[PDB]
Design a protein around this nucleic acid. Sequence first.
RNA 1: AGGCUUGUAGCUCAGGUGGUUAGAGCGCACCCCUGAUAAGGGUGAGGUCGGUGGUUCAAGUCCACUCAGGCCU
Lengths: 313, 314, 101
Amino acid sequence: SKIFEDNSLTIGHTPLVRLNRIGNGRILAKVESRNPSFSVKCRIGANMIWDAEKRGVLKPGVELVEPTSGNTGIALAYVAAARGYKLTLTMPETMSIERRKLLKALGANLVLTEGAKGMKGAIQKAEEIVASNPEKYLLLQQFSNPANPEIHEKTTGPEIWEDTDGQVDVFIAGVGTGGTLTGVSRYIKGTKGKTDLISVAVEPTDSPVIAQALAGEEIKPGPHKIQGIGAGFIPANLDLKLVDKVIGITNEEAISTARRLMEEEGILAGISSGAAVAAALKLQEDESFTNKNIVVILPSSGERYLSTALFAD
Amino acid sequence: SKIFEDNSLTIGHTPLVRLNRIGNGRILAKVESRNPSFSVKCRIGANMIWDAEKRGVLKPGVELVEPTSGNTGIALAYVAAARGYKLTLTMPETMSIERRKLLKALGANLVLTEGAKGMKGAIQKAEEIVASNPEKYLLLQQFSNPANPEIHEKTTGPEIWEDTDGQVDVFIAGVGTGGTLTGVSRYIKGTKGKTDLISVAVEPTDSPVIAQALAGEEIKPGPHKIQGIGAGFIPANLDLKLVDKVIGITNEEAISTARRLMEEEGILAGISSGAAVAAALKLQEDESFTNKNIVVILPSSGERYLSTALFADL
Amino acid sequence: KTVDKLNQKQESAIKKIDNTIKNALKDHDIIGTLKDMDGKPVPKENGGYWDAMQEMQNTLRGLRNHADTLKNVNNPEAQAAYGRATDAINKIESALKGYGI
RNA sequence: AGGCUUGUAGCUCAGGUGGUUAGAGCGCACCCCUGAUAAGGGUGAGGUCGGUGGUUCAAGUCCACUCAGGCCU
Ligand SMILES: [Mg+2]
Ligand SMILES: [Mg+2]
């Protein structure tokens, strides 16, 4: 007898599907597009508004503002619609009219900044909205909000531990904000006491900023096609004392694996989903990772990226 | 300890969410968009392949032909990719590049029929393919395969009964093939023995072929844009004995309610999802239905219909 | 402080920086990079594709190699040219950071 | 015979105290642009630093002798 009161509570409890034709059957895929807005971000669009309601800052009258150009804007738009709040999404003018139809028909107030400034013009506009009336607007700050890795410590951590019955040996997830990699590694290494877990991060080879941070190097960001990961910096939600390895993925082998993961598996998967599976394939070429149970986060579906270059002709 | 062996075993267990701002607050929406190909068809796209394996006709070595372009073409595409079979979908040439790119990506051979024919041309070429080599191709026939209402008796029926704890009074579901209305009504009226259930059927007003069959008139279809429902005839899966009421939803009422279902309650809804909630609102105008637990099926997601007339905003 | 004179490489690296900015860091090129980072096309005149991401990886390799030449120098003409290289990289990275997330 | 001096990428050349291995301009290959050519831009290829020894922690750079050219002879 579980009737949900709104759609923001329906997050989590996603399948762990064994991949039988990509790899040797040890790769376990956690399909995160089985969420109410079909991304991994649905967990953090719910908890960042849950946390803001617990600590009293989100009252009737307080509106929501956050600069985003990805799946977080869809994830904040349904929770602000389900819980009943107002939302203003700042973003560049570069994104498509078909992306803006999904947000405007879901109840968002789009502020389109000029595209030559990119995301900083989208970020810095969100502060002039907040500095207009700071007692009225709320800025969520997904790269520094501790409610981002805490939903993964409460939900997607215990789901992997109870599906595998404690047999997960390698956990692989791409890092855009780092809440998924940190929250799962906090539950398995810290709460359940399994220090032997190998937490592998995935980054683009065209912007390898995690490997440069671990090697003591200056930060070298750059453009990449693997959408969802590769922030260009080290965010506050990524805890680098839990990252045991990092694997870089080129843009052509991320698109190639996502086409395999649709055609050979039936899983609708974006580019970041195929990027994380290809890191499990690079890791299994080592002969010590052949009796290891590998859990790979598949963050989004391919139907959202259907006007892109993932679908060739 | 639950690791699914392929993606087709992950059907069902879709949540039942209360709609707080539409109606009095006793409409209980079952969001069927949270299936592995994001439709209601995943349940019948998996069972009709599971049933064909157990009948002995879907061996390793035989094909799958289905004259289908819509959601159930996507549902047969991912299960045949998950389980290893080969799919050939026959459909007219007047279809979008965008849906053809989703079906090549799941590894479906797409055969394009003449656009002057339409859907009946896509059916005729499917029986031309099976007549060439009858031992190697296989039809599925979702309008007449009894595995279409069987999975809703095994999955959807219990998921409504165990989430409402035996308190479902009215069941609204749209009829395109009549499986989700037949399977749940056979579970609650037949197995659990609740004959007081009011199973209603949602149809287009432009093509009201269910209301013409219950009134004993001649079946005359018509064009509409509530895509998913309104097949233009009475399918063999729909048994008319279970249908109590028939509610006709106008095409602009489904667009308006689906937009109302996205911006007020955060649920990505297609046009047929808005038609089924609009029938719940027409039914609550009577005071005899205002104290009833309305349970309604939301079959698809609005992100799939993103270039259609559902999104007339910039 | 002892002012120094340039090599043939530092005075090359100044002219490479100023011409890379006035011909490859236009506002059209930062638009076309972000269009390409999430896939939607900017086509050619009758077929093909203009790859703006490869032309910005080339611009970022150029401005970083030619600023490492002019880094520890002491000529005020070469410290001022280092400022244009660092500010042009910061103009790019502020457009790329946190995009698509 | 003496005192000197030239020798560094396919060509002409810089190379500050002995420290990125070693760099520029023209030319070669590719890319933006010019309907096209020139002009203009970017990335890449090309090195027994005349040869052999010594010194130094480290030699294209400092020495010793040769190989080829020019100067008064
Ligand atoms: Mg340009
Ligand atoms: Mg020479």
